[PDB]
Design a binder for these strands. Structure first.
Ligand SMILES: [Mg+2]
Ligand SMILES: [Mg+2]
Ligand SMILES: [Mg+2]
Ligand SMILES: [Mg+2]
Ligand SMILES: [Mg+2]
Ligand SMILES: [Mg+2]
Ligand SMILES: [Mg+2]
Ligand SMILES: [Mg+2]
Ligand SMILES: [Mg+2]
Ligand SMILES: [Mg+2]
Ligand SMILES: [Mg+2]
Ligand SMILES: [Mg+2]
Ligand SMILES: [Mg+2]
Ligand SMILES: [Mg+2]
Ligand SMILES: [Mg+2]
Ligand SMILES: [Mg+2]
Ligand SMILES: [Mg+2]
Ligand SMILES: [Mg+2]
Ligand SMILES: [Mg+2]
Ligand SMILES: [Mg+2]
Lengths: 83, 138, 94, 123
RNA sequence: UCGAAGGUGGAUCGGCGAUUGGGACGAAGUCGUAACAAGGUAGCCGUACCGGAAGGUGCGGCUGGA
RNA sequence: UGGAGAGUUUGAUCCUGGCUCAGGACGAACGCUGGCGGCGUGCUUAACACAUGCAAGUCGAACGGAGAGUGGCGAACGGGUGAGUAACACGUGGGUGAUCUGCCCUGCACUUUGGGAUAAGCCUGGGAAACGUCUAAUACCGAAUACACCCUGCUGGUCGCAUGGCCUGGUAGGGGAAAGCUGCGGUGUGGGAUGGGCCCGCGGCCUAUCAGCUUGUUGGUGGGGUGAUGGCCUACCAAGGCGACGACGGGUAGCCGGCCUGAGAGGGUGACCGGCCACACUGGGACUGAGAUACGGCCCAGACUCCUACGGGAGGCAGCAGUGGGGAAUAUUGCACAAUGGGCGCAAGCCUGAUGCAGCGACGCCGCGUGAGGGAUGACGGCCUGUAAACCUCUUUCAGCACAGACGGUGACGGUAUGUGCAGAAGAAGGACCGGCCAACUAGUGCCAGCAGCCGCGGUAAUACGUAGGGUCCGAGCGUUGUCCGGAAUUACUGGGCGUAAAGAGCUCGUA
């Protein structure tokens, strides 16, 4: 080692735990959407789209998920909601 | 490498016959066989007769010019003069016998050197034997 | 991003540069995008540049390196691009 | 052949015989001395020829011919090995360089000196 | 859940091996004299059996047979 | 715009047909032998193991503070090596309506508003060594605003190569950001430029003593997933895919621009220099990020080696030097960031074993030196040489010491190249071969000692062996081994053959 690698190891512990937290929060949001749809619950699931699609594009604004990924999630949720 | 009467004595003119005309042509101008090989391979690249270009290249040598100029007797005498740098070419010290002068080249002598400055109008044609030395190689 | 460099094509103790547009990442004698010009062992340094291509690459936003920025300022393609009144007229040969 | 018969199966190159296999594409090769002996040659030639078996570093054992006149070479001495045939002896295709490593140069030799590794005597 | 490495019946490829089989080259030391002339029984091909060894003899073939 | 031949089967001849010579080269190595310059070049074998120093840091115009520490960028570039890979890896062609791009510049619009922590600092334990309570930010976070932008619904026109694209199309629903301190920045979104990623057309080694291979296998539909299209992945139906035009196997291999040869077509090779690929002790991962095979990062598993006060740890030169091995063989533990390239900073600067140079080795290709005139009855000397020397003047390149001295606030090269001066020949020539081919001839040893590229020389008079003279051929080099092309029309497409020379299946039938 010897280098400024010792500093950049300390960052990659810090900056993982930020991005791990946001990626996991999106999964539980998207997961709870699908259980609302599979119940046949329209008024609850219609609310959960605007909850999740808010939360997806905020994670793109962080620079975590990248906007093309964030867009293709929102597309999948809306086409699921319409049926 | 400089060679440094008999070598001429064997040839006269002081595959059997082919090598002998090359031998006088070489030891006249004081050339080493590797340098003589190079002037042949340049001569055949040039247009015209390939043999006639060879004698043009050997006559173009700056020390040969001194011999013709007669500034120094005995072509081997001029080797001692030229490398010592007595001569000058276009206001530059040529300390090199292998210098090949072109057209409009001005050969002057250096100041002092006390023991007459003739100019080159063109590279002289053969009129001013080659076919042995051409048929020697290749 | 894109950058105007010099590239050392000469033999030992006798460099000749050619003024190359390339990436910042590439090795010194690497692949150019375009060779613009050429350029130090003379009483008068020899400098030649395409004025048309220099204006194109600077207009895109190719950042000159520090010693190239001298040569552009001399020949006066930098002042055409920048549009400041120092103008052009330099060099000669002899 | 017909030209279609060449298209189906092409023209194979004729397989080249490598000349000196023990050297492994090297000009010289070292080795011990595991025998030193004499043989009678083949042919109308007659004489005693000094020969030696050399296990090379390449781990191949082959005869060698010691050029010159007389040799030190006892058992378990280290020896270079050249290449190039001696056509009187059947099989023998290598030679021992003289004057290199252990093999000392030929004594009193004043002509063809480089081949036999004899240093020039006092100018 | 997938998952490296590590655990414990064949396939392919090689090293050494008691011992044994033919091959090349060398000196020519014995045993013969099979082929080249009708080579002293015309030779050779294919099988078959036999014999120290070259070879011998059946059946069919061939001319590269006097 | 160039295309030679020669020897050798026989008493002799002609043909077929090998084998061997002349030629050119090299990342070469050995001998014998070396005087200096210029210029490139230098572990081809063990991707074998590595002791020491250095090869990536930088900013106080972000921040507490009083070098270290948080933070931003860089660290994916530069440099190394050829293990792996017969593959979309590579080389040339296209495609991307199937997509990404930090920094850079150059349009447009904004930089609103609030809070919570945590290293440093102190006090603890742990040990030979090395890794419990407080305070800031351009660190990190709830919101607001954005109509460019992302998602979904209903609909306008055009373009065409089918999915579909484009006109920021028009609508109406729901949502997207930011940072400040002494001139540089910061978020969002049009455009341009760079770099990539992913598909396909064809091209490029050996093998049938490898003939069957495949089950996520070939396709479809609905989902998941990626920057993006795709059995890329997954769950259900269909039963297909590839192969004699060599599939699936085994062997070898970095590929190419080029480079060696040849008149060409070909054959060999992939050094330096310049692209693309793969790999970083061996394997399997992912994280951070605009970008990762992440050399000098992380985690785990193995193999190997160090420090130890035995409690615990740490490390990987296929960076540059270097060391030991292995080899017939390959370099200094150099100097400097002056120049060109790169990173960070507003800048001054600070790093750079990239790079520019120096040393070493005739390893290669060039260029100069070792003397120039005159000199005879041809001294002496050696042997059956030589106008050479002897001796009379002369020039001083390189070497030697002197003085001046660079071109590229300051240059490593370098008091170097280079110029002008002081004398004096003083400091400077080897190495093969001479039987014929193929240039050069005469005087101990006995088929022994030995020589030899093929003929073949030695059995008492040797142009062939060993030595001495004398000659050639080349000369700071000359010979010999190893390797590839040529000669070889000797794998023949250009350009060959098969009654007897090697060569017609024993004959017919018939699939591709
Ligand atoms: Mg999707
Ligand atoms: Mg055995
Ligand atoms: Mg008989
Ligand atoms: Mg008979
Ligand atoms: Mg008969
Ligand atoms: Mg019987
Ligand atoms: Mg019969
Ligand atoms: Mg004969
Ligand atoms: Mg394979
Ligand atoms: Mg960034
Ligand atoms: Mg390999
Ligand atoms: Mg030919
Ligand atoms: Mg690994
Ligand atoms: Mg990421
Ligand atoms: Mg390293
Ligand atoms: Mg790194
Ligand atoms: Mg090294
Ligand atoms: Mg041929
Ligand atoms: Mg023939
Ligand atoms: Mg027939």
């Amino acid at each position: 080692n010897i280098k400024s690698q010792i500093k950049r190891i300390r960052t990659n512990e810090r900056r993982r735990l930020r991005n791990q937290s946001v990626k996991s929060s999106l999964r539980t949001a998207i997961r709870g959407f699908r259980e609302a749809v599979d119940a046949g619950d329209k008024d609850k699931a219609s609310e959960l789209l605007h909850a999740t699609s808010r939360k997806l594009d905020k994670a793109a604004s962080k620079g975590v998920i990248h906007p093309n990924q964030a867009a293709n999630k929102k597309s999948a949720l809306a086409l699921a909601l319409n049926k | 490498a400089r060679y440094t009467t008999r070598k001429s004595r064997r040839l006269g003119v002081d595959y059997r016959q082919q090598l002998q005309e090359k031998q006088k042509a070489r030891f006249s101008y004081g050339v080493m066989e590797k340098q003589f090989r190079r002037y042949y391979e340049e001569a055949n690249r040039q247009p015209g007769k390939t043999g006639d270009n060879l004698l043009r290249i050997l006559e173009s040598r700056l020390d040969n010019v001194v011999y013709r100029a007669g500034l120094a007797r005995t072509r081997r005498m001029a080797r001692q003069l030229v490398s010592h740098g007595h001569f000058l070419v276009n206001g530059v010290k040529v300390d090199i016998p292998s210098y090949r002068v072109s057209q409009y080249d001005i050969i002057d002598v250096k100041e002092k050197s006390l023991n007459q400055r003739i100019l080159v109008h063109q590279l002289p044609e053969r009129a001013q034997t080659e076919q042995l030395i051409v048929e020697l190689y290749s | 991003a894109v950058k105007i460099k010099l590239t050392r094509l000469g033999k030992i103790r006798n460099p000749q540069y050619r003024i190359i547009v390339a990436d910042a990442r590439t090795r010194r004698d690497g692949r150019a995008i375009e060779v613009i010009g050429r350029y130090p062992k003379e009483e008068p340094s020899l400098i030649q540049i395409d004025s048309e291509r220099a204006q194109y690459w600077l207009g895109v936003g190719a950042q000159p390196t520090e010693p190239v920025l001298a040569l552009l300022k001399i020949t006066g393609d930098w002042q055409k691009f920048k549009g400041l009144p120092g103008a052009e007229g330099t060099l000669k040969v002899k | 052949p017909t030209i279609q018969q060449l298209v189906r199966k092409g023209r194979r190159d004729k397989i080249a015989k490598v000349k000196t296999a023990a050297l492994k594409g090297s000009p010289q090769r070292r080795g011990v001395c595991t025998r030193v002996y004499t043989t009678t040659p083949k042919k109308p030639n007659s004489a005693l020829r000094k020969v030696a078996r050399v296990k090379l570093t390449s781990q191949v054992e082959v005869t060698a011919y010691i050029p010159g006149e007389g040799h030190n070479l006892q058992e378990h001495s280290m020896v270079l090995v050249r290449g190039g045939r001696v056509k009187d002896l059947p099989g023998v295709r290598y030679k021992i360089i003289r004057g290199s490593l252990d093999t000392q140069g030929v004594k009193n030799r004043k002509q063809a000196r480089s081949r036999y590794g004899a240093k020039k005597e006092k100018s």
